[PDB]
Amino acid sequence: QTQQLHAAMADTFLEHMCRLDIDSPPITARNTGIICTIGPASRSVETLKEMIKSGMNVARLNFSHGTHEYHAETIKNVRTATESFASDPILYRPVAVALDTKGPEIRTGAEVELKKGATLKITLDNAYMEKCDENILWLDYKNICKVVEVGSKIYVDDGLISLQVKQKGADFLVTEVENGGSLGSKKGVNLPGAAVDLPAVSEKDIQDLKFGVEQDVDMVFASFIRKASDVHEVRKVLGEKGKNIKIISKIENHEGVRRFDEILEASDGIMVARGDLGIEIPAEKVFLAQKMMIGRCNRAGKPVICATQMLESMIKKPRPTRAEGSDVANAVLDGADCIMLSGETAKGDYPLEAVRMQHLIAREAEAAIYHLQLFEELRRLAPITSDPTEATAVGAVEASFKCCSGAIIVLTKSGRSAHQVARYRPRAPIIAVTRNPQTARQAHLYRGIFPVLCKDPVQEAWAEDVDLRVNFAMNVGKARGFFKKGDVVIVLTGWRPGSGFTNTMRVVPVP
Amino acid sequence: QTQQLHAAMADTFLEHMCRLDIDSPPITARNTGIICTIGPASRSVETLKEMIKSGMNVARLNFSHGTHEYHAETIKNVRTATESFASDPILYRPVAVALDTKGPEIRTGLIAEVELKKGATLKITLDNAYMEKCDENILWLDYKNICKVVEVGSKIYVDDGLISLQVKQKGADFLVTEVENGGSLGSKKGVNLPGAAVDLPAVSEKDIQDLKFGVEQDVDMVFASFIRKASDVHEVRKVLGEKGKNIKIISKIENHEGVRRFDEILEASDGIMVARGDLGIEIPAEKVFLAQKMMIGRCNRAGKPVICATQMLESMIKKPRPTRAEGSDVANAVLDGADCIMLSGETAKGDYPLEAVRMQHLIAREAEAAIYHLQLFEELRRLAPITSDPTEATAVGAVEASFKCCSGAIIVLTKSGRSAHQVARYRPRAPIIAVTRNPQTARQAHLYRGIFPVLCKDPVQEAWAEDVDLRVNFAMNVGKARGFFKKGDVVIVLTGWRPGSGFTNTMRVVPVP
Amino acid sequence: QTQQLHAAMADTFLEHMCRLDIDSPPITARNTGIICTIGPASRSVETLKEMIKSGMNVARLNFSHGTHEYHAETIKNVRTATESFASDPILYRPVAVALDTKGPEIRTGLIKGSGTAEVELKKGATLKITLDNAYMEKCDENILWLDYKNICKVVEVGSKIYVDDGLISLQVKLVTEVENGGSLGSKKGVNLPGAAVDLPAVSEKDIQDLKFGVEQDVDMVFASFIRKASDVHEVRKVLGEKGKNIKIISKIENHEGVRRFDEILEASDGIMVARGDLGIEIPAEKVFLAQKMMIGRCNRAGKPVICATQMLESMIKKPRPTRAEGSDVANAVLDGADCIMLSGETAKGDYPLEAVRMQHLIAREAEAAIYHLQLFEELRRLAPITSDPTEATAVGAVEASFKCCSGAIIVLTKSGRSAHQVARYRPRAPIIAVTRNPQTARQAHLYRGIFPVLCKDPVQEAWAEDVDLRVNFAMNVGKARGFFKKGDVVIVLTGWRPGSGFTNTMRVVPVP
Ligand SMILES: O=P(O)(O)OC[C@H]1O[C@](O)(COP(=O)(O)O)[C@@H](O)[C@@H]1O
Ligand SMILES: O=P(O)(O)OC[C@H]1O[C@](O)(COP(=O)(O)O)[C@@H](O)[C@@H]1O
Ligand SMILES: O=P(O)(O)OC[C@H]1O[C@](O)(COP(=O)(O)O)[C@@H](O)[C@@H]1O
Ligand SMILES: Cn1cc(C(=O)c2cccc(Cl)c2Cl)cc1C(N)=O
Ligand SMILES: Cn1cc(C(=O)c2cccc(Cl)c2Cl)cc1C(N)=O
Ligand SMILES: Cn1cc(C(=O)c2cccc(Cl)c2Cl)cc1C(N)=O
């Protein structure tokens, strides 16, 4: 059989694992979104066209480096490459734009070798900003000594250098060098366990967010989110003009993990930013934090992105390591809506191969999901409500499993009716048909959603305009190989025009 | 607080049982069909009007005794009482007519009675000179293949298992038997042969005659007696012909053979009666429950109606309240998954027939709310096959949707019954309001748990979309008047894409106006 | 293909039901207790010997009828028939004695002077219930007397008054309307379901009867109409020091008792679902809710539950039961009732040995039909994770007994306790409880699974010899009763030192 359907019939989680078959081929549809960071290796129109063809859904722009001119030129080239496929709306793929903020930073003020088990004093004394050595160190954070206790740890430069504070004061701390390594200039400082009172948006962040509103970006990946106030501050900065732009909170430290629930409720989605998280928490604990956040986002129905070092060896090599193949599969198996590439697409030698590998692994892992347990648990956990769209969404997903459907076709203006289908995790691809260009770009955040942008003019009778939109989605799935003529599909629509009225589920053969 | 909703939220079967609460009131919907047997206690037009008000759905006619003229007058009385409520279509309840066959039987001859002594020796003859010479030593019976179908050491029961026998010696013409249980041996008494593959025909010559008579009398269904194998149901269907092609055949499972060959019988039938009366005569009386829960579960799994039957409320023949065993039996049958429950002597000949119908209605309604729907609905789709039928996928989608929004009802437009029947096998908590213009469809829909059939008598509109909207709004009126929901509750609506039967593919989540 | 093991291997509850097989025979062991009420039909030592053989575990004495002399002579005859098998301790079956109390009953007077005279009542007639005590022996068709003096002080006009197991229904318009007629007899139960009857918990008759129970060495008390936890505490304090080891089973018989169930159960030693009175006090259609609630909560708490009343009611006059009756017995066992009961079927009926036998047969077929895979998983999950070694041993023993499909679980016990802890996890395997305490042996019949054996062998001086003597005694019992043969595998529960509270040892042994 195909698409692990023998494993799909299994009575237990263990027997499901036992029946996983490498000779069982998957369907064409790949459900997990792929976020690629664009930099020097993948910035040209020519490379970006191939990036789309290899399977990029979201172009991430990291505002830790680079000016507004560099980033606008990148955004222009993304759109140039995307709109070159716009002549055929049947085969057109919407490509999202994401702004990743720099965030609040703690920085040090040429290599000095710290001895393993020596005395290093931190200072706030401003004349030692060019005078950093093995005895004296300066930081740009001014409230360091209040948020750090006696015996608290201080990490410098990606956690390569670890200090531990022996005596606390007001203008100073005196530490002990626990992990050594060479100390340098302008290097990142992390504080594990602490509740850092640095602002939610920096002064750079505010200008960069406003630039996001100008450049019509679809989502904000917001760095170092510690609490619900922080999301609300990003939201306030985005204003009324940026109010449909999704805020994806990056969970990057202990405080963010501990306050996950208030952050999730305030945000439009989550990034497991494992890079900084693995600097701030113990590296053996990052998987616990990953599975927790993915689980709870699956429970809430909000997007979750797994990020950082997923195919890290692909920067230099054309094949990944076996850890890396396993990381991508297990993130998709956990339930991550999106998977991310950073230096793999931004600076490395094989960006096209890394996108391809993420596409190949995800499709293979989506087939291996135990939907029998998963649909049972998601139903049980989600409450009894009186929203008609929610009842329609769960009925559609139920119907799709009963007929082993080719797709669930959903008409949507804002995204939501399709978002509500996606949260019950069907096997069948969700074709979200929309006239709204931002909705089509934002749908890549949600597992299972295959967004199509309908460019056909509005028909004169409303029921006919709905049928035309359903037909357009019939034509897409036939041309992308999702289904053929006479395959049974699920069709979701509503009773009147406008958002909020999806109430109608139809089971139809493809004409 | 209501309809056992706290118990419904429980994570285990045990905690579900622990949370069952006597101060948690059920909804006014009662889902289980009540089949009342009509006889001398309930026959008049006046009494039958009260029977429908008390909650009768199916009037059962037992063709074991009584002339065709007598039975047709019963049927006419049923229909007169039923049609007295037709002036209010919103309040009108459809009433089915059922024909229960006599079946083939083995009878004794003529003695006037004698005395069978316990531990003594008796002799069976097929010799027709001893036909009217039955005594305490010699017994005649009317089934000539009896020596072929029993072996040595096997049991023979006489007079509803009052007298037990055991054959010690057998011949080609005759049997020699020791008396196991003593008792009064009378004339023309029933004979059961436990464990025997009896070769009595599917349809007897009296049964042939009565089956064509039901076609003439327009009966909705047939309760066919003593069904042992697939070819037996085919014979019933053959005898009914194309004139009776829409009449439902419910097989009565009455012996060991019918129980053992259950899967082929079920596949050939429209539904199954657990005919416990004769079943406990033929099989040991402590094994009836095993056969009850087997047949109910398989019928549930197949999606075909199952009737629980015989002595459900027995003491109510003489008494106005049932016993505690009787209360429990009706409850646990509904909990097992029986689509219909039956009354025999309680409504045929007993002193309190209205109280018996009212008691089955009160017990079923309570037991329907105590169903653990969470485990049941989970198990029902897990055992359901993946097929490409649009209606089947719509049905399960509708039931899923109904649990998610705790809907007042699932409103189904149906021509032949079938779309509403497909909903019914997934066991929703919500009542299934089946709207039909077909009168028989409305009558036969009482066979399936959950279904509340309404017969629309408003004429066909010219625009079919308006005719669909009229029938949906009619079903809204019914549930409002019967207390199923009120304005602004959310219900599930099932329609199809074109007129005609077989096209139910549209599920809508709709506010009550 | 035996014991419904095809059914046992099902992955769902529905498929377990589908696989239930009439040609799959059960084991010889019957786990559910049978309590028989002894009256005129079962009184004689002759009938009582055949009761024990047909499967009686507990003799119930109903003190709503009869004098203390009648009951003492009944008790003596129970003990004569029980001790007539004491000569071989391998084949001796311990028989418990239960006292069922009268309680706060309301009863009618005598029809025309006698207990056995009956009048006929018709639907729509009128009869006047009076309170003056001259009419206490000349009750007829017109005038009735009842002993509760505060009858007018609680009820209203339009309230329903039920006489003789709810069969005669009246309605106060006291001048009443006969809602439901039938046969009216002498000294019949009266119910007032609307009323808040302020009759005392333990009446003066109850005190004399409870005193008598202490003097006659009864094993348990079935206490009538328990409303609240302080009713249980009142019976406990009436029994005192002298009756401290007598178990208190609280009969739940009205609406208040159901409502305050959790506080009753924590105070009691066990529960009776007293369905007869319960079905008049609450709507009869709600009895099964109340039955399954109580059986479920008692299974969850590990305390005994008895299903009682009209389980085989037609067998008072018939040698076979109705289809409802066979279903009720099965479903009560399937629900999880530790004991089943017969009342008038064994007390006064024409076929009393056939009722005991029919309960034995149905229960044994139903015990095979238990979906053990779901049940044990649910009982484990709802068990607290505790620091008690005895609880860990018992649950390991049950788990081990499922894995080897065990012939028995052999448990040495002083007080009953270690064997009770096995019983609450519901194994398929019979629990052979070996004890030297004879009261423990009688009281163990309250718990599903437990086959109690009384060791009459003297104490060996080395303690490990004495332990192995009791283990091999139990081994001989199941060999003699056909529970297992030689080479079959049993579970043995013992402890690390003598005295109660130290069971920590689970052994998986071949039968020698
Ligand atoms: O997901 P959203 O934003 O509610 O959009 C769903 C809406 O789309 C429709 O199917 C089509 O509406 P339009 O004709 O306005 O596009 C509505 O009937 C339904 O309410
Ligand atoms: O249950 P059945 O017999 O398939 O009938 C269901 C049919 O009822 C309808 O909803 C209405 O059909 P009619 O207008 O022919 O009565 C159809 O669209 C659907 O196919
Ligand atoms: O169930 P109880 O009363 O705790 O009895 C179990 C006790 O019985 C024994 O198995 C045997 O002890 P005795 O030798 O004192 O009878 C103990 O090891 C164990 O503590
Ligand atoms: C093969 N596989 C399948 C799964 C799931 O489908 C699954 C994933 C998340 C939640 C829930 Cl509830 C489920 Cl069931 C996991 C694995 C794995 N990690 O090995
Ligand atoms: C309270 N109760 C609830 C049920 C069921 O819902 C049920 C019935 C049949 C199959 C399946 Cl799978 C289920 Cl879950 C049974 C009882 C009972 N017999 O006591
Ligand atoms: C056949 N049957 C099996 C059972 C049980 O085993 C069972 C009983 C009580 C609790 C739990 Cl949790 C379970 Cl699983 C019930 C029936 C029935 N009532 O029909």
DSSP string, B452-466: EEEE--SPPPSSHHH
Residue A388 to residue B378, Cβ atoms within 8 A: no
Q: Whole-angstrom Cα distance, residue C220 to residue C372?
A: 30
Judged by DSSP in three states, A126 sits in: helix
Q: Which of C279, C300, C327 sits opposite B289 (nearest CB)?
A: C327
Q: Please name the residue of chain B whose CA is at the shortest distance from the CA of residue A495.
A: B508
User: Do the annotations mark residue C32 as ligand-binding?
Assistant: no
In terms of Cα–Cα distance, which of C24, A428, A293 is closest to B284? C24
Amino acid at B125: T
Contacts for A271-274: CB closer than 8 Å, 24+ residues apart: A271/A221, A271/A304, A271/A305, A271/A307, A271/A340, A272/A304, A272/A305, A272/A306, A272/A307, A272/A336, A273/A223, A273/A307, A273/A308, A274/A306, A274/A307, A274/A308, A274/A309
Q: Whole-angstrom Cα distance, residue A329 to residue A366?
A: 8
Q: Which two tokens stand for residue A437?
A: 């260009």
B301 lies within 8 A of chain C by CB: yes
Q: Whole-angstrom Cα distance, residue C250 to residue C247?
A: 10
Say if residues B172 and B124 touch (Cβ distance below 8 Å).
no
The separation between the first and the last C-alpha atoms of chain B, rounded to the nearest angstrom, is 26
Q: Which two tokens stand for residue C415?
A: 């007080």
Judged by DSSP in three states, B190 sits in: strand
Residue A420 near ligand 1, beta carbon < 6 Å: no
Who's near C218: CB < 8 A, 6+ residues apart?
Answer: C97, C98, C99, C246
The neighbour count for residue C110, using CB atoms within 10 Å, is 17
Q: Which of C14, C276, C326 sits opposite B383 (nearest CB)?
A: C14
In terms of Cα–Cα distance, which of B320, B363, B354 is closest to C169? B320
Q: How many CA atoms lie within 13 A of B369 on its CB side?
A: 28
Tell me the Cα Rg of chain C. 24
Say if residues A273 and A342 touch (Cβ distance below 8 Å).
no
**Distance between B296 CA and the closest CA of chain A, angstroms:** 24
Q: Which two tokens stand for residue B243?
A: 């004139």
The separation between the first and the last C-alpha atoms of chain C, rounded to the nearest angstrom, is 27
Q: Whole-angstrom Cα distance, residue A409 to residue A400?
A: 11
Q: Residue B360's Cα: distance from chain center in Å?
A: 14
Residue A17, CA distances (Å) to A8, A10, A239, A324, A329 in order: 10, 9, 48, 20, 14
Judged by DSSP in three states, A395 sits in: helix
Q: In degrees to the nearest 10, what's the CA dihedral of C392, C393, C395, C398? A: 170
Say if residues B202 and B235 touch (Cβ distance below 8 Å).
yes
Residue C276, CA distances (Å) to A294, A473, C185, C273, C448 in order: 55, 65, 18, 9, 23
Q: Whole-angstrom Cα distance, residue C163 to residue C129?
A: 12
In terms of Cα–Cα distance, which of B487, B497, B512, B491 is closest to B401? B491
Say if residues B150 and B193 touch (Cβ distance below 8 Å).
yes
Residue B235, CA distances (Å) to B200, B228, B232, B240, B243 in order: 13, 12, 5, 9, 15
Q: Whole-angstrom Cα distance, residue C318 to residue C354?
A: 9
Q: How many CA atoms lie within 13 A of B488 on its CB side?
A: 0
Say if residues A260 and A272 touch (Cβ distance below 8 Å).
no
Say if residues B31 and B57 touch (Cβ distance below 8 Å).
no
In which order are the strands placed within the sheet that holds B106-107?
B106-107, B190-192, B155-158, B163-170, B174-181, B121-125, B138-140
Cα dihedral across residues B279, B283, B289, B295: positive or negative: negative
Say if residues A475 and A493 touch (Cβ distance below 8 Å).
no
Query: Looking up tokens 């509340």, which residue turns up?
Result: B452
Instruction: Starting from the CA of residue C474, give the closest ligand.
Output: 3
Q: How many CA atoms lie within 13 A of B174 on its CB side?
A: 10
Atom index in ligand 5 nearest the CA of residue B371 equals 6
Q: Whole-angstrom Cα distance, residue C396 to residue C491?
A: 10
Residue A2 bears catalytic tag: no
Q: At A509, which helix (H) or strand (E)?
A: strand A502-509
In terms of Cα–Cα distance, which of C12, C1, C21, C34 is closest to C353? C34
- Which residues of chain B have a CB within 8 Å of the CB of C255? 22
Instruction: Starting from the CA of residue B427, give the closest ligand.
Output: 5
In terms of Cα–Cα distance, which of C42, C97, C299, C342 is closest to C212? C97
The phi and psi torsions of C396 (rounded to 5 degrees) equal -75, -35
Q: Whole-angstrom Cα distance, residue A250 to residue A224?
A: 6
Query: Looking up tokens 């045929």, which residue turns up?
Result: B348
Q: At A218, which helix (H) or strand (E)?
A: none
A392 lies within 8 A of chain B by CB: yes
In terms of Cα–Cα distance, which of A213, A234, A226 is closest to A254? A226
- Name the residue of B392, B412, B415 to mutate for ligand 2: max ligand atoms within 8 A of Cβ: B415
Kindly give the pairing relationship between strand B221-224 and strand B248-253: parallel
Say if residues A259 and A226 touch (Cβ distance below 8 Å).
yes
In terms of Cα–Cα distance, which of B470, B473, B472 is closest to B506? B472
**DSSP tag of A47:** H
Cα dihedral across residues C121, C124, C129, C134: positive or negative: negative
Q: Residue A478's Cα: distance from chain center in Å?
A: 29
Site residues for ligand 3, CB cut-off 6 Å: C 412-415, 417-418, 494-495, 498-503
Q: Please name the residue of chain B whose CA is at the shortest distance from the CA of residue C321.
A: B285
Say if residues A492 and A505 touch (Cβ distance below 8 Å).
yes
Which stretches of C27-73 are assigned E, i.e. beta strand?
33-37, 58-62
Kindly give the pairing relationship between strand B271-275 and strand A488-494: unpaired
Q: At C127, which helix (H) or strand (E)?
A: strand C126-130
The phi and psi torsions of B469 (rounded to 5 degrees) equal -65, -35
Nearest protein CA to atom 17 of ligand 6, as residue: C334
Who's near A428: CB < 8 A, 6+ residues apart?
Answer: A400, A404, A405, A406, A407, A408, A489, A490
Q: Which two tokens stand for residue A511?
A: 């004409």
The neighbour count for residue B482, using CB atoms within 10 Å, is 18
Q: Whole-angstrom Cα distance, residue B360 to residue B54?
A: 10
Q: How many CA atoms lie within 13 A of B43 on its CB side?
A: 14
Q: Which two tokens stand for residue C414?
A: 């002083």
Residue A356 bears catalytic tag: no
Say if residues C34 and C363 touch (Cβ distance below 8 Å).
yes
Q: Whole-angstrom Cα distance, residue B58 to residue C22?
A: 30
**DSSP tag of C425:** T
Say if residues C192 and C154 touch (Cβ distance below 8 Å).
yes
- Which residues of chain C have a CB within 8 Å of the CB of B14? 296, 299-300, 375, 378-379, 382
Q: Which two tokens stand for residue A380?
A: 């049980």
Q: Which two tokens stand for residue B340?
A: 């219909």
- Which residues of chain C have a CB within 8 Å of the CB of B382? 12
Domains of chain C and any CATH numbers: 1-29+367-512 (3.40.1380.20), 30-103+201-366 (3.20.20.60), 104-200 (no CATH)
List residues bridging with C105 in a β-sheet.
none
Say if residues B190 and B159 touch (Cβ distance below 8 Å).
yes
Residue A443, CA distances (Å) to A265, A448, B101, B219, C195 in order: 19, 9, 63, 57, 65
Query: Looking up tokens 């004769």, which residue turns up?
Result: B278
Who's near C380: CB < 8 A, 6+ residues apart?
Answer: C395, C425
Q: At C263, which helix (H) or strand (E)?
A: helix C261-267
Judged by DSSP in three states, C46 sits in: helix
Cα dihedral across residues B83, B89, B90, B96: positive or negative: positive
Q: Whole-angstrom Cα distance, residue B424 to residue B402?
A: 12
DSSP string, C266-318: HHSSEEEEEHHHHHHHS-GGGHHHHHHHHHHHHHHHT--EEEESSTTGGGGT-
Amino acid at C407: G
Q: Whole-angstrom Cα distance, residue B95 to residue B83?
A: 9
Q: Whole-angstrom Cα distance, residue B88 to residue B78?
A: 18
Residue C324 to residue B319, Cβ atoms within 8 A: no
The Cα angle at residue B472 between residues B470 and B474, in degrees rounded to 5: 70
List residues bridging with A99 in a β-sheet.
A61, A220
Kindly give the pairing relationship between strand B155-158 and strand B190-192: antiparallel
Who's near B507: CB < 8 A, 6+ residues apart?
Answer: A392, A395, A399, A504, A505, A506, B394, B397, B398, B401, B492, B493, B494
Size of interface A-B (CB pairs under 8 A): 106
Q: Whole-angstrom Cα distance, residue B401 to residue B395?
A: 10
Residue B372 near ligand 5, beta carbon < 6 Å: yes
Which subunits count as partners of chain C given 3+ CB pairs below 8 Å?
B
B346 lies within 8 A of chain C by CB: no
Say if residues C409 and C398 touch (Cβ distance below 8 Å).
yes
Q: Whole-angstrom Cα distance, residue C37 to residue A323?
A: 73
Say if residues A342 and A308 touch (Cβ distance below 8 Å).
yes
Q: Whole-angstrom Cα distance, residue C377 to residue A462?
A: 55
The neighbour count for residue B65, using CB atoms within 10 Å, is 9
The Cα angle at residue B252 between residues B247 and B253, in degrees rounded to 5: 150
The neighbour count for residue A413, using CB atoms within 10 Å, is 17
Q: Whole-angstrom Cα distance, residue B47 to residue B257?
A: 39
Residue A498 near ligand 1, beta carbon < 6 Å: yes
Q: Whole-angstrom Cα distance, residue A39 to residue B256?
A: 79
Kindly give the pairing relationship between strand A181-183 and strand A33-37: unpaired
Kindly give the pairing relationship between strand C126-130 and strand C143-145: parallel
The neighbour count for residue C174, using CB atoms within 10 Å, is 18
Resolution of the entry in angstroms:
2.1
List residues bridging with C307 in a β-sheet.
C273, C340
Residue C271, CA distances (Å) to A65, A478, C231, C325, C360 in order: 75, 66, 13, 22, 21
Say if residues C223 and C248 touch (Cβ distance below 8 Å).
yes
Which residues numbered 363-382 in C keep a CB inside 8 Å of some CB on B? 365-366, 369, 374-375, 378-379, 381-382
Q: Which of C107, C187, C205, C300 is catalytic?
A: C107
Amino acid at C358: M
Say if residues B399 and B428 touch (Cβ distance below 8 Å).
yes
**DSSP tag of A117:** T
Q: Which of C17, C325, C331 sits opposite B297 (nearest CB)?
A: C17
A496 lies within 8 A of chain B by CB: no
The neighbour count for residue B466, using CB atoms within 10 Å, is 11
Q: Which two tokens stand for residue C122?
A: 């018709």
